[PDB]
Amino acid sequence: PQETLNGGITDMLTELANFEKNVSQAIHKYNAYRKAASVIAKYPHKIKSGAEAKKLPGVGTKIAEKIDEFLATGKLRKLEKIRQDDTSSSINFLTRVSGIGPSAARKFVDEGIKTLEDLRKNEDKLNHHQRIGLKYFGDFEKRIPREEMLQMQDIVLNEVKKVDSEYIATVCGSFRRGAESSGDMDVLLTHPSFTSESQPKLLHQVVEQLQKVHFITDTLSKGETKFMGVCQLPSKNDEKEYPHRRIDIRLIPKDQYYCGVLYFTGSDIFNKNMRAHALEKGFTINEYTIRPLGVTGVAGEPLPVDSEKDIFDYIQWKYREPKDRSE
DNA sequence: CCGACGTCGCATCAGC
DNA sequence: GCTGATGCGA
DNA sequence: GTCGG
Ligand SMILES: Cc1cn([C@H]2C[C@H](O)[C@@H](COP(=O)(O)NP(=O)(O)OP(=O)(O)O)O2)c(=O)[nH]c1=O
Ligand SMILES: [Mg+2]
Ligand code: NA
Ligand code: NA
Incomplete structure (x- = not known):
């Protein structure tokens, strides 16, 4: 369906979902709101009442009540109140930085640190991941056009094969499903020498090469099987440079690779x-x-x-x- | 009434 | 120093 | 918060 059909309701539930995860630390109430948001976003009718919405799987009594209040008044008292609460809105915002979860955001706001500005004057209280997330705050909330993803795939596949031509790499996620845009790049990697019953340098050599040609710019985390980092396409000419993108590289054993690819x-x-x-x-x-x-x-x-x-x-x-x- | 609600690698913390 | 818990992301 | 054993 479309946005303005039930967008006001789905946005309300999405806001509510975030405050549950980030402020109340109620992860399951977070998923409940998102599940309710999804099923409503698929409902091909402009909802008239909370009872009409209650018929759907994921929408119970409490949300039916909230939908009633929204339809009648155009707003939600609790959400309106929490939007203008200094502590809660700041805690909820700081969680948008990758590396800062609801717990770290809790401490920051507890000791005065409320803003991106405030984070910037306090580098020594941020771990490595949090610094990268702060540095690329804007770039990480951007989506990646499919054309750029294709150029990114060209680089990954080329360099991976360059290290060892027996490597098998596959860009999965929404990109492999043909989406016009992606939020990140998930690369799945395997090699004949790596089974479940089976070196610990297979992932390292690939990450290294992508750093040598300056595709990978930063590193959030890296072990023997999983890499989480940052990458960037080369700048064409004097033309404006590309934003920094999130990339994950996963080393999966051969006999589990296609269950990994499928998943x-x-x-x-x-x-x-x-x-x-x-x-x-x-x-x-x-x-x-x-x-x-x-x-x-x-x-x-x-x-x-x-x-x-x-x-x-x-x-x-x-x-x-x-x-x-x-x- | 009351528990499930996906799971797990990595960094970093708390404890010994 | 080691081990296990916790936070985080996805 | 919603569902269901
Ligand atoms: C979070 C999640 C991940 N996955 C496995 C399949 C998701 O489609 C998928 C890739 O996760 P993603 O990168 O967070 N979502 P996406 O790749 O389909 O699209 P986007 O790049 O985030 O826009 O990974 C699940 O099967 N269920 C999930 O809830
Ligand atoms: Mg993806
Ligand atoms: Na229902
Ligand atoms: Na975050």
Whole structure:
């Protein structure tokens, strides 16, 4: 559907969701509001009452009441009050910095630190991740055009193959599903020398090369299997330079790679469906392996997977392109 | 009534 | 110093 | 906050 259909309601619930996660530290009440926001955003009618909305999965009594108040008054008393609360709004805002969660944002505001400005005059109280998030605060809240993602893929695939041509890299996420834009770049990486029963330098050598050609600009975290950092496309000429982008590089064992590729391709809703259907066919699916359920639920050894299709076969589904995987 | 509500690698903290 | 908990992201 | 055993 469209925005102005129930945008005022979905925005209200989205605001409410954030305050729950960031201020109240109620992660489950955060997901509840977002789930309610989603199902309403799919509802192809301009909602007339809270009761009409209550018919939907995810909308209970409390939200029905709030929807009633919004439709009747055009606003929400509790949300209006919390928007103008100095402490709460500042705590909620500081969490927009990557690295600063609700706990760190709590401490900052507790000791006077309320703003980006305030963060800037207090570098020594920010860890490495928080500094990067502050430095690229604006760039990280921007989306990446698909064309730029394609240019970014060109670089990743080229350099990865350059390090070792037996590497297998795959850009997953919404990009692989064909989205016109992405929020980040999730790269999944494997190599013949890396199985589950199987060096610890495979991920390091790839991150290193991407730093040597100056694609990777910063590093949020890095271990033997997962890399979280920052990257940037080269500036064309005197033309304005590209924003800094979030990139994740994951080293997954060969025998788990395609369960990894399938999982990190998405979408969420699709992964819910596929696993729900997988169970009723007698198989359990996590991000790593596909295992057969016994007659009492006792899972067996993981079944060999050498392609995405292999998984679809196991649960008797026709292999569907990432293009058609929103649900 | 009352627990589930996805899971886990990495950095960094609290404790010993 | 080591181990395990906690915060964070996704 | 919502759902459901
Ligand atoms: C957060 C999350 C991740 N995933 C696995 C599949 C999501 O589609 C996917 C990629 O996560 P993402 O990068 O946060 N979302 P996206 O890549 O589809 O799109 P965008 O780049 O964030 O705009 O990873 C889930 O299956 N359920 C989830 O709730
Ligand atoms: Mg992505
Ligand atoms: Na309901
Ligand atoms: Na944050």
